[PDB]
Amino acid sequence: GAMGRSLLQHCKPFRGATKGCLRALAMKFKTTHAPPGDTLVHAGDLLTALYFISRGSIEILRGDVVVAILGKNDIFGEPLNLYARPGKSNGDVRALTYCDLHKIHRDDLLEVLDMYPEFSDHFWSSLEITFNLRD
Known about the structure:
Layout (H helix, E strand, L loop, with lengths): L1 H7 L2 H4 L4 H10 L1 E5 L4 E3 L7 E7 L2 E5 L2 E6 L4 E3 L14 E4 L3 E7 H9 L2 H10 L4 E2 L3
Parallel strand pairs: 6-9
Antiparallel strand pairs: 1-8, 2-7, 3-6, 3-8, 4-5, 4-7
Helix pairs in contact: 3-4
PDB class: transport protein
Keywords: cnbhd, hERG, transport protein
Assembly: monomeric
């Protein structure tokens, strides 16, 4: 489907997902369309979603200082497989330009990966989170 094809643009983490696995992931991902200036994550928020940027630019702030710019195929959040509870964000995440993001909630991603344990190992090993927001 269209979402599955969109997710494949994030090459390495989705490499090797079978049709059933990619379909199950795609059903839980949503496309977020953020206009300039919209804040996607506030400092201190629980890190309950993983974000893949499809296009557009994102500002990461620590305090009110811009500390990173993320763009196409960059990823932000925290690895979801390391703790039973979500961490809190060390920074604000805001759109610089119009942005299209693929967003999956933590609970939904972990539930899908329950059904695909070998893919889950590949996913967390090959995920290279561009900006780890864990405080």
